Amino acid sequence: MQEHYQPAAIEPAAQKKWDDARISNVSEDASKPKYYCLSMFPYPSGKLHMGHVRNYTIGDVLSRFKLLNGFNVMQPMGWDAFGMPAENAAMKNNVAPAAWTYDNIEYMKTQLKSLGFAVDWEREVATCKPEYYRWEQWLFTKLFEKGIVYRKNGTVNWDPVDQTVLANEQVIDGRGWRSGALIEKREIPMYYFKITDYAEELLNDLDKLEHWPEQVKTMQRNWIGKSRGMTVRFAVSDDSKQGLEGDYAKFLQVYTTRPDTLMGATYVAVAAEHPLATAAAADKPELQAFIAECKAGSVAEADMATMEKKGVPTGRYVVNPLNGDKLEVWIANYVLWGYGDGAVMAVPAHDERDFEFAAKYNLPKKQVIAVGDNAFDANRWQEWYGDKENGVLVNSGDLDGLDFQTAFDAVAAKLQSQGAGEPKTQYRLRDWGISRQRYWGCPIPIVHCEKCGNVPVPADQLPVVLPENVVPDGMGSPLAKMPEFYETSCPCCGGAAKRETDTMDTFIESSWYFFRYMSPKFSDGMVSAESAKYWGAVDQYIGGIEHAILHLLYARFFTKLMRDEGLVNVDEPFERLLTQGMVVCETYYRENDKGGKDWINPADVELTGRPVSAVLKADGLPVVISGTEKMSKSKNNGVDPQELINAYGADTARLFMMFAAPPEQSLEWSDSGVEGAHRFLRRLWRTVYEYLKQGGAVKAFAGNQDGLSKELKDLRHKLHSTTAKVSDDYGRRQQFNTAIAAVMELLNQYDKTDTGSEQGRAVAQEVLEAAVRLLWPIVPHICETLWSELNGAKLWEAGWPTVDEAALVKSEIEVMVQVNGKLADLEAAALANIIVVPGRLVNIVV
Ligand SMILES: CC(C)C[C@H](N)C(=O)NS(=O)(=O)OC[C@H]1OC[C@@H](CCCn2cc(-c3ccc(OC(F)(F)F)cc3)nn2)[C@H](O)[C@@H]1O
Ligand SMILES: [Mg+2]
Ligand SMILES: [Zn+2]
């Protein structure tokens, strides 16, 4: 054994040992219990970043832990390869997105392998290969003919300078993010998944997920946004019907989740597109401009609640069907056409948004709910105003005294008998638009024929192959400019026809890849029945919290779609979910020509016992230290993991990632932290080397520990309590820094114990054999190497250390007490119950 720890001399040999034994290449073997541990697969962007290393180390710790506990562990990796990065890189560098993608995959794969992740590379997938995306085209066609996928005109933001469609997030003050040109709202035909048909299943099945964080489930419930409410129709006043047609001349229909407060409505609000808004605006230029501003907005959903709420009165009035009050109709910017009736009622006394709106415009507020003897003040909002559980109706005529639910049914009865309303269930959830006006994505398998309509491509003809010999230019979607691609024959009639040129939302690839891993070479379906039956669901899923809403909802949706097609038998794709935080780092800059700053990478900086100023490495001139935030290209504060691997090895990188913070926490990049991790690995190496240099390996202590010395019994207690702590950390708490600190405490106590005797060496052997197996999920290369110096058996066959319960029992007390012959540590306790015979009796002489 070499005296000093040198990761470059051991880490490649360990990887070759694991690869040779094929420990990570698993099959559908019903002889060992399966465990499917999955980390969210990456975009092949070019190189790994620190978020990748954190994520896939966490996954590897859990996988190797289950491996050592005897599970048949699948840990697959692959590449989420479609999307805009490759298109951007294509325009910047004049290379094909496919070629750029495949180069990145090869480089990143090498990086992953060098980190020693126990990955089944025989299950690798690349979602931009036709062998992958043919199966989501297939599923698309199946759902399209069922109507679960449909085609419908929708509104997009068109950038006329960049000649491309922009998400609301790419619109700033009505202008494209890069071009700066005013965007144009355009109606175009697009394809949609009818995810609203599955809204109740997706909401209710969340309750099955007892091993999901409550916040993720809460966020999905809020996103689905089910409400049980009331349709209410307010008759339009006889003086307010000019310009209105149909039922819009007769009534204004609204949806409310608080019909118990209907007696307290003081106005109503309609969307900019509502026929009442149109009719009132016909001769009022201020309303026309207000409607035009609402339509021109591009507010992202995560920002909808933060936008300033504004409205205009219309001069039109409706009648409250309960109390007869004549209420003025406002146009408001928070009322969205397409949600419900595009019209709401306002109760400023019991809805905070209505309160602020009414306060802005001095609109009335009528209290109709009371909670105890609390004071109602129309000038200041109190939280109890919105209370639904503990409230009673007031100022509501014959409804006074009722609680929420009884008032709800009473209002339902009253409205239903009048014909003015009825209970109704709504969902905030929108259907899933999947059309993308981009090249580097899965072609939509539809052919347009003037005789036959939108025709799905038959299954024998799939895939529709995206041509890879393309270099996007930035003057429109390439596929729309390629007749060699879109000109075709109709598969129903053989006539002249045109392929769909839009591609799929790349969330589609990530909505089913975890099933594809089960049979990644199966050419007769999305996933073979034998492999889906064996692997079932993902036991452990690990990834960033930023995917808690959309990706997870889409994956749960695709699982239920695939279940309903008969391809799988699970209702839910992911049993346990571990969400990881972000990686942050200090930022550095040098001040600019024009009162700005230019940001310098941390590795290209060197700081100067208390550190002071930082300077550039190449020259030594000073740099400005700035704030700590998430690693990004924006402020040039990303630390390349390849440099961390180059400087210290894979094991140090993995150890620092796991010791620095729990998975959910932000992980701060720390030079001293990385050095601390490396020094601990040196220490572990030194401990085994010094142990072996003074006598070589012995049979580890096992069995009855009667006759062991007090000090060695104490070390065995620390040992098996550590094994218990670590197992509970990996298996239950999924907090790995405390598992590391626990082994550190074991090694500390070992360091303070004389293990030089025959029995001492056998306990030291037991200690070290456990410590390297406890740490092998985190730092497998050094532990694999050290284990082989301690013991000749296969480490993965020796398995996870077992807790010796006998080592955890205390030394016992048993003696008699006698005051005047009648029934320090023993004198102190029997006094709580001065002659004492050693160990047998005590006698309290008094
Ligand atoms: C399932 C599928 C939808 C997943 C999809 N293909 C995807 O998200 N793919 S992915 O490749 O983006 O991420 C693959 C996984 O692992 C990384 C996780 C990132 C956690 C947050 N986070 C980012 C960073 C960070 C960024 C840049 C840096 O470099 C710099 F820019 F140079 F600075 C340095 C650090 N730190 N922390 C991610 O959540 C996912 O679980
Ligand atoms: Mg259950
Ligand atoms: Zn046809």
Listed residue (109, 326, 342, 364) closest to 239, CA to CA: 326
Listed by the residue before each break, gaps in the chain with C–N over 2.5 Å are: 608, 823, 833
Cβ 55 vs Cβ 579: under 8 Å = no
Listed residue (489, 565, 555) closest to 526, CA to CA: 565
Bridge pairing between strands 226-236 and 251-256 = antiparallel
Burial annotation 355-385 (CB, 10 A radius, 16+ → b, else e): bebbeeeebebbbbbbbeeeeeeeeebeebb
Q: Is the CB of 50 within 6 Å of ligand 1?
A: yes
Ligand nearest to C-alpha 212: 2
Euclidean distance between CA atoms 14 and 12, whole angstroms: 5
Helices (H), 299-437: 352-361, 404-418
- ∠ CA 642-648-650, nearest 5°, is 65
What would the two tokens of residue 602 be?
């941390």
Task: State which of 50, 111, 514 you would mutate to test the pocket of ligand 1, scoring each by most atoms of that ligand within 8 A of its C-beta.
Answer: 50
Q: Is the CB of 386 within 6 Å of ligand 1?
A: no
- Residue 452 CA to ligand 1 center (angstroms) comes to 44
Q: Is the CB of 127 within 6 Å of ligand 1?
A: no
- Residue 575 CA to ligand 2 center (angstroms) comes to 9
- Residue 312 CA to ligand 1 center (angstroms) comes to 44
Atom 1 (ligand 1) nearest CA: 40
Ligand nearest to C-alpha 205: 2
- Residue 50 CA to ligand 1 center (angstroms) comes to 8
Atom number, ligand 1, closest to the C-alpha of residue 637: 33
H or E element in which residue 785 lies: helix 780-790
Count of residues for the chain? 846
Q: Is the CB of 582 within 6 Å of ligand 1?
A: yes
Residue with tokens 């708490």: 733
Atom 41 (ligand 1) nearest CA: 543
What are the residues whose beta carbons fall under 8 Å from the beta carbon of 416, sequence distance 6 or more?
422
Q: Is the peptide bond before 463 cis (omega within 30 degrees of 0)?
A: yes
- Residue 208 CA to ligand 2 center (angstroms) comes to 6
Atom 7 (ligand 1) nearest CA: 42
Q: Is the CB of 55 within 6 Å of ligand 1?
A: yes
Euclidean distance between CA atoms 750 and 684, whole angstroms: 12
Give, in order, the Cα–Cα distances in Å from 238 to each of 241, 250, 267, 527: 6, 9, 17, 63
| Extended beta strands in 428-502, E state | 432-433, 435-436, 446-449, 453-456, 487-489, 496-499
Listed residue (411, 421, 423) closest to 264, CA to CA: 411
Euclidean distance between CA atoms 439 and 545, whole angstroms: 28
Q: Percent helix, strand, coil in the chain (nearest 5)?
A: 40, 20, 40
Atom number, ligand 1, closest to the C-alpha of residue 43: 11
Query: At 176, is the secondary structure helix, strand, or coil?
Result: strand
PDB resolution in Å: 2.1
Atom 32 (ligand 1) nearest CA: 638
Phi, psi for 765 (deg, rounded to 5): -55, -45
- Residue 38 CA to ligand 1 center (angstroms) comes to 15
Query: At 710, is the secondary structure helix, strand, or coil?
Result: helix
Atom number, ligand 1, closest to the C-alpha of residue 580: 20
DSSP assignments along 147-158, one per residue: TSEEEEEEEEEE
State the first-to-last Cα distance of the chain, in angstroms, to the nearest integer: 66
Atom number, ligand 1, closest to the C-alpha of residue 80: 6
Euclidean distance between CA atoms 656 and 778, whole angstroms: 10
Phi, psi for 590 (deg, rounded to 5): -125, 135
Q: Is the CB of 80 within 6 Å of ligand 1?
A: yes
Ligand nearest to C-alpha 543: 1
- Let me know if domain 630-808 sits in CATH 1.10.730.10: yes
Euclidean distance between CA atoms 445 and 463, whole angstroms: 8
Q: Is the CB of 551 within 6 Å of ligand 1?
A: yes
H or E element in which residue 753 lies: none
Query: Which amino acid, one-letter code, is at 306?
Result: T
Atom 23 (ligand 1) nearest CA: 51
What would the two tokens of residue 475 be?
């003057």
- Residue 448 CA to ligand 3 center (angstroms) comes to 8
Cβ 298 vs Cβ 306: under 8 Å = no
Euclidean distance between CA atoms 759 and 762, whole angstroms: 5
Give, in order, the Cα–Cα distances in Å from 569 to each of 282, 515, 533: 57, 11, 7
What would the two tokens of residue 168 be?
């609301």
Phi, psi for 615 (deg, rounded to 5): -140, 160
Cβ 722 vs Cβ 745: under 8 Å = yes
Euclidean distance between CA atoms 512 and 558, whole angstroms: 6
Atom number, ligand 1, closest to the C-alpha of residue 507: 3
Query: At 616, is the secondary structure helix, strand, or coil?
Result: strand
Ligand nearest to C-alpha 489: 3
Listed residue (143, 94, 93, 103) closest to 126, CA to CA: 103
Atom 6 (ligand 1) nearest CA: 42
Atom 31 (ligand 1) nearest CA: 632
Cβ 52 vs Cβ 101: under 8 Å = no
Q: Is the CB of 663 within 6 Å of ligand 1?
A: no
- Residue 648 CA to ligand 1 center (angstroms) comes to 23
